[model samples]
Target: AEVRTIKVFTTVDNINLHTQVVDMSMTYGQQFGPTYLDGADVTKIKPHNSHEGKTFYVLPNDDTLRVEAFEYYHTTDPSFLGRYMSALNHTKKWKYPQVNGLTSIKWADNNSYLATALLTLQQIELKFNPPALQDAYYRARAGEAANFCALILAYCNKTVGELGDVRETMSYLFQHANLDSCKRVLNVVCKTCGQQQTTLKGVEAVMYMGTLSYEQFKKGVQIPCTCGKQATKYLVQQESPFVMMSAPPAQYELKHGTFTCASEYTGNYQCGHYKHITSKETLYCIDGALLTKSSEYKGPITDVFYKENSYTTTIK
Candidate 1:
C-alpha cells in the first residue's frame, strides 16, 4: 500500500462574521437599560478568542475513509473567520465546476452560490433539528425541505413584480398546508429554480396558487417514498469488517566475491576452500587480499537472494 500526505496551515486571522446570528443581530439600544451599550463598548465586549487550529491525516477505506487527528494548536483571535473564508474561496476557484473537462466559468457564480447555500443550510439544520435526528437520513430529508423554501423565495424575489404578492402567496401556502405537502411543494419549487428557461413570474404565481389550492383540498396527508427501504439495505450491506494480522518479516544477506563451494550447504563441498568474513570493514578482504570486491548494485532484490550459500546474513 502507498501512503499520501497533505498539510493544512490554519491561522487565527480569517473567521466569518455574517454566519453568526448573534453577531448579525446585535443593535445598540437607546436607553441606559441592561441591553443598552455604546458602540465602542459593544465592540470591546465581543469575543476575542475564537480561533481553533488542527491537523488531520486521512487514509483510504472501503467506502468513505479514516481520518486521524495528528495535532492541534490553540490561539485567541477573532480573525480566523477571515482566514477560513479566504481558504474556502481559493479552494472553490481551484476546484470550480467544469464542462467538457475544463472550468466552465472563470468566475463561477453557480459554484459560489452553491457553496454559500450549503454552508447556510448546514447552520440552519444545526439550529432547527435536534442533535439525535441530525444524522444523514434526517439531514437529507430536512435539506429537501430547506432547499424547497429557499427556492420558492428566490424564485418569487426574482420574478414577482410586487413583493407583496410573493409574501401573501408564501403565507397562504405555509398557513394552509401540512408538513408533508409543504415538503413536496418545496421540492417542486427547488426544481423550478434551477431551470433557466422557466419564467420566474409565471412559476411563482402558478406555484403560489397551486400550493394553496392543494393544501385546502388535502389538509392532512403524508408523503411516501422508497428511499428509506433502499437506505436500510445500503447501510446493512455496505459495512466493512475489520481484520488484524502480523506483518511479514524483512530479509537481509551478505554476498561472496569468488567462492564455488565454501561449506556443506553447497552441492560440491570440496570444490572451493574459503572462509566467510562478516565485518562491514574487513568482510570484502581476507589477509589483505581482495577475495571479494565491494560493488554497489540497485534493483528490486527480494528474500530469495539470501537463501543461497553465495550470500551470508550480517546483523547491523
Candidate 2:
C-alpha cells in the first residue's frame, strides 16, 4: 500500500493555541493510522488549511499542497496582547488615588509608584529566559510608565551625586595623606559623629566636620567635650599644636581679640561648640576674660580655656 498522509494546519498566533491544534491532530492520527501525522511533524511541515477550513491531503501522486491561512492571524502576534495586558495591570495598580495621599511632596508622589514598579519589574526580568530579553522588557515597561521613567532618572542622578562626593573626598584626602591615614580618619569621624547610625538631619550637620584633615590633628583631635548631658562642646586651643586654629573672632580689641573684664566679647570664639547646637564652634567669656586670644594672654590657661583672677574664658 502506498503511504498516504493528511496534513492539518491552522493560523493560531498563540503557542497554546497552536499546541491545541497539534494535540487534536495527533489524537486523530493515533486512533486512525500512519497517514495521520503527529503534532511534531505538523509543526515542522506547517501545512495550511483552506479558507473553507478543509484539511489538505498528500496523496502518492500529489505530495505537496498549499492552503491560504487567515490574514488576521499573520498580522497580529499573540505575545503583543500579553505584553499589553501586563502593562495595563501595572498601570492600574499604580493609578490608585490613595497613592497620592501617601506622600506630601509632589516629587515623591510622582516617583514612589514608578520606583516600586521598576523594582518589581527588575525582579521579574531577572527570571526571564535568554537573559537578553530583560533589556527589551525593561525598556518597554519603562516607556509605558512615565512615573517609572522619571524615577529611573532620579535614581541615576542620586547615585551619581553620591559617587561624586565619595570620589571628591578620596581625592582631597589622598593628596595630603596615605590611604591608612584616610581610613583612620574616616573611621574615627564616622565613629565620633555616629555617622553610620545618623539620620538625614544628623548627617547634614556632621558631614562638614569630616572634611577636616585628620593627618594634621591625629594626636590632638579632641573626643568631643560635654559639660553635661545636654551641654556638649568642642574646643581648640592656641597652645595645642594639633588643634587647628579656628578663624579669629570678629572683634579687634583687647590685644588679640580677648575680652577682658567685659560682660560680652564681640569676637569669634570656639567655646561651647557642640553637636546639640549644631555649631561648629562658639566664642564665649567664661568669666570676664576673653579666651579667643590665648596666644597673647599670660594668665593660667587650660588646654581649652584661660582664667585671669575670677574670670575664665573658653573657645570652641
Candidate 3:
C-alpha cells in the first residue's frame, strides 16, 4: 500500500518525523482550521499531538528551516523517505519533543540537529581538537547529534554497547608514549645549590648493545634543584660495582635442610653509568614451565643394591 500522511513531533531545534503512516480521516484534534495568514502575518503558534498519533511539528517561533533528510535505513525504497516527510508536514500534530533522551546544548546559537552533527563530525576528523570520538559518543548518547552517532555506528559495523569498550581500548593501544630504553639511575649533587639527590637519566641507549658511551653519558648531565641550581657533577659517594650472576647450583645442602632454588635460567643487569664498561653481555631467556636439571649420575651406582642383590637377599 502507498504510505500517506505520516506523523511528526516538534523538537528544540527541528522536527522529527516517523516513517510510519497515519489515517487521514482519523481526526484526533490534529486539525489546523480557520487560521489563514494575511499579508506577511507572523503569529507564533504551536499545536499538540496525542501520544497515539506518533507525530511532530516545527514551531512557528523557531528559526527558519531547510529540507534536510535522514535515511535511517540505507535502502533504495522510496516510500521510507516519502512517509517520513509526509509525517513531518502535519504541523498541527507537532508538540514539544521528549527532552529526557535528547542531547544537551548549553548555548544553541543558530544550530539545528543536522548542523550540530556535521560540526561534530568535522571536529573528530581534525584529530587536534578537544572532545574525541569517545566524547562524541557520550554527547550523541545524551541525544546531541545522535543521528551522527547512529550513522557512524552503522558504517563501522559496530553496536552502541560495543563502542563503549572499543573506544577505551583504542585510547590505550593507539594513544600513548613510545618507550625506547630503560632509565639509567644516577647519584649526583648540585654544585650551585650544594644539595644531593638520586635521579634517573633518560637518554636513548645505543641500539647495538643498549649502552651509552662514557662521553655521551656524562655530557650535559643536569639535575634541577629546589634552590634554583642545576646539579651537574656526581656526588662524593662510595663506589657500587655492578654484579652479574653467572652459573647457579640447582640445590644447596645446608646443615639443617636441602634448600632448593628456582629451576629456571634467569638473567639480571644494572643500568648505570660505567667509566670503562664497553663489553656487552647477553642472556637469552625463554618463558614457560620451569626446567629441572637431570641427575648428575644418569646410571645406577654399582655400590647400591641392584636386582641381582635383591634376589640373592630374598633367596637367603
Candidate 4:
C-alpha cells in the first residue's frame, strides 16, 4: 500500500561524503526520504497513468521510473448554460421554468431540462450542477440508480427514436452510460480489414465528478488490429474494479548507481556556525568504477552515526 522506506541522498555525492565523514562502524545508516528520480522517461506509460490514475508497474532491471503528484481538476468550463437554455427552448418551455427539484414535476414537463443538465455534467465540472441536482447525479454515477440512463434515454426519445435536439443533448452520456471505469477491456473489430483484437481502454479519473473519462476511446487511438489497420468499432468486454483512493496512485523507478560527493567544504564565520557543505551526484553503472580507481576507495562504507552532543558517546 506504500513505497518501501529507503535512505535517499539528494544526490549520490551526499552518500559518499556522508560515508567518509560519519561514524560508519554502526549497524545501520541514516534514513533520508523515499527515492525520487527526476527527469525520467515515462511518456510511454503516461497515457495509462492519466486514464487509470493508478500506480504504474516497472519491471526489475528496467530503467528508473519517477512518480509525480498532481492536483485533480477539469481542464474545460464547457458551455453548459447555453446548451441548457437551447434544450429548454426546444422543449417549448422558453419561459425559464423553475427547477423545483428534478423529481418534483412531471417527467415530460422537465425531461429536456433534466436530461440536458445531466448530460452537461458528464463533460464539465460537477460544481456547475445546481445543489438540488447534485445528489441525483451522484447516485447515478455511483451505480446506485441503474435505471438512470434508461430514464434519460426515454426522456430524450433516444429509445427506438431518432436523435432529436433533446436526445442529442444527452447523447454522449447516454452512449457511455454503462462505462463503469476507464480501464475497460474492449473487443474491437477492424473496419478497413477483417480483423479483431481485444484492447484495453486507458482512462483518467475526475474525482471531483466521481467518474472516469475516456473521451479518446475508439477515436482512432487504439492499437492497430492484426491486419495492421485501425479498429473502428468496439464493445466493452469488461471493466476493471475501481478502488477508491484519496489521491491518484504513485510511481517508482528502479536505478543502479554509486553515490559520490562532488564537492565538500568546511567553514566557520558566524558564532556557533561551524559548518560543512557537500554536493553529491550518482555515478551510473560503469561510471561508479571511476571512484574506486581514483585512489579514494577504502573498502565500503556501511553503518553510520552522528554526533549527538560534544560529550555524547553512546549508541542505542
Give the winner by TM-score: 4
Q: Tens-digit lDDT track for model 4 on 60-103?
A: 11112111100011111122222222332333321222121221
TM-score of 2: 0.16
Per residue, candidate 2 scores C-alpha lDDT tens digits across 1-316 of 4533343432211121121233332333342222212112222333233312233211111111111111211112223222322333333233222121111111222233233223223221122221113333344344434323322332223221121222222122222221121111121232334321112221121122321322233233444423222212222212211121111222222233322121112222323111000001232222211123233323212111111111111321
- Clash count, one per candidate: 11, 12, 12, 8
Q: Rate the local accuracy (lDDT) of all candidates.
A: 0.22, 0.24, 0.26, 0.26
**Cα RMSD to the true fold for all candidates:** 32.5, 25.5, 27.2, 34.5
Better of 1 and 3 by lDDT: 3
What is the model-wide C-alpha lDDT for candidate 3? Answer: 0.26
Q: Residue 294 of model 2: what lDDT? A: 33
Q: Which regions of candidate 4 fall more than 4 Å away from where they truly are?
A: 1-79, 82-171, 174-180, 186-195, 200-236, 240-316
Ranked by lDDT, the better of candidates 1 and 2 is 2
Q: In model 2, which regions exceed 4 Å deviation? A: 1-88, 92-111, 115-133, 145-316
Task: Give the TM-scores of the predictions, in the order they appear.
Answer: 0.15, 0.16, 0.17, 0.21
Q: Write the per-residue lDDT of candidate 1 for residues 103-176, one digit (tens) a residue.
A: 21122222222222222222211222212113321433433222222222332232211122212333332232
